[PDB]
Structure formats: C-alpha cells, structure tokens
C-alpha cells in the first residue's frame, strides 16, 4: 500500500484570481504547516483529433 509524492513549492508572486493583476506577500511562516483534504472532483479538457 505505497503512496505517491509530489513536489509542492510555496510561492510569493501570484496572479490574482479575482481580477487581472498580480500580488506579493511576505515570506512563509516559521514552523510546521500541515493540510488535510480529499479531492472530490476535477476539471478536464479534450484534445481535437479524429
């Protein structure tokens, strides 16, 4: 029952999703950061072919 891993970075200059813009924020916090979820759906896209 092995798992999968993914290389998650933390950014600081992002393109806002509310508008057409760009934002900055402070560097990350000092300490341990955890986060638990469970994907329940997703978004795909076809590919024009024959």
């Amino acid at each position, epitope marked *: 029952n092995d798992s999968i891993t993914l290389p998650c970075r933390i*950014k*600081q*200059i*992002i393109n806002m999703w509310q508008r057409i813009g760009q934002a*900055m924020y*402070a*560097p990350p916090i000092q300490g341990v950061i955890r986060c638990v979820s469970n994907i329940t759906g997703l978004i795909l896209t076809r590919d024009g072919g024959s």
Partner: antibody
Amino acid sequence: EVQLVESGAEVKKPGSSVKVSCKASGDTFIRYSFTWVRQAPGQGLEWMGRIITILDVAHYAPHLQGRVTITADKSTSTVYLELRNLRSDDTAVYFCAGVYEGEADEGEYDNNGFLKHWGQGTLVTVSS
Amino acid sequence: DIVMTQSPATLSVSPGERATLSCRASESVSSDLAWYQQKPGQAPRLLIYGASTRATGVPARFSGSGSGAEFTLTISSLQSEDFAVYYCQQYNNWPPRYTFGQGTRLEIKR
C-alpha cells in the same frame, strides 16, 4: 555574483535637476533588488530608497520624498536615479547596491533588506 | 520615529585584543540588523545580516548578537587590517522606511 559599475562624477549648478546612472553586469538582471545610498564627506550613510525589478516598484524616503525618482530598464540592464531642485547642501558621494532575491521569474521571492554587493560611488558637487 | 545609536562614540583597542560595539534601538526590532565596515573612501562590506549570522567569504573572528533594542558585535582578536568605521542598520519596518546608524571610529589603543 554581479558587478555594479557607475557613471562619472559630476558638477551641477544649484536649483537644478540631476540624473545619475549605475550599470550592473554578471547575472540575470531581474532577480536582484536595488537600493541607492549616499554619504556626505566623512559622515553617516543616508538611505535614499530602494526598488524591486520583477515588479518594477520603488519606495522612497520620507524627508526626501517629492524630488526623488528611481527607475530601471530590463533591456539595457541599468538603473537610473534622478533628484529634483538641486541644493548645494547635497554635494556627496552616491552608491548603487543590490542583493539576490530568489527565483523571481517563477514566483518565489523573499524581500531581503540588507545589501550584499556594492558599487564604487560616484561624486556629485552641487554648489555655486 | 525609530532611531538607533551606536555605542561607544569611539572604541580603541590594540592588536591581539577584542572589540565590542552595541547598537541601540527605540522599539522592538526583532531580527533586522546589519553591520558594515568602511575603510575611508572605499566601498563598504557586509559582515552580519539577519542580526544573527555571518556573511560568506569573511573571516570568522567577528560575531554579534542581541535583540529587543540592544545589539552588539565583538571581534576577539584584532589584526592589522581591521581599522575602519563601523555602522549598524535596521530594515524591519514595512512599508519600507530604512535608516542608518551614526558610525564609530576604531583605531588602535596605542
């Protein structure tokens, strides 16, 4: 690292406006911040203000605010300072400084404040 | 207005000996301070950043520490080319309003 060459020293008549340059060379240009600091002969250091390239935004000093203007240009890899209403009380030596920041182009950035590399320091004589 | 002051107004000490300097703040500046030495007429040099660590490519005989409003730098054993004026500088506040210290003159105790 990078190297910061400057322009040639200058003399300006009072009540004028001065422009001064500083060129950097040695590494990818955006990934470094920049700052301008000056010193009168044998005195402390006068923090003038700084600029962030990747966003191209500059911050200025409170009691200097109004007659200052920093600017940059990613094409030619240079930095310009301009100062307005020249007054003889500002003859001094000037320095352009920088510091690495991180993978800006990929959205990483840490906004350091201190000053790693240094230029020589041009001289400006405002006087009669 | 946040203001720092160097101390003493002048330190003097002979070779083989240690120098001690203390920078003074007006509020709590958590870990934002830096130390540069300037030989007269020369481009200054970065010694201590983060107020707790040493630069790269620099002799290990320097070290500082401190917090709150009191900071310090000490060098245990002077050498022949440590004769320069020394400045402390903070970069804490945002929006950025940075400021520089006075600078203290250091010549041999002789």
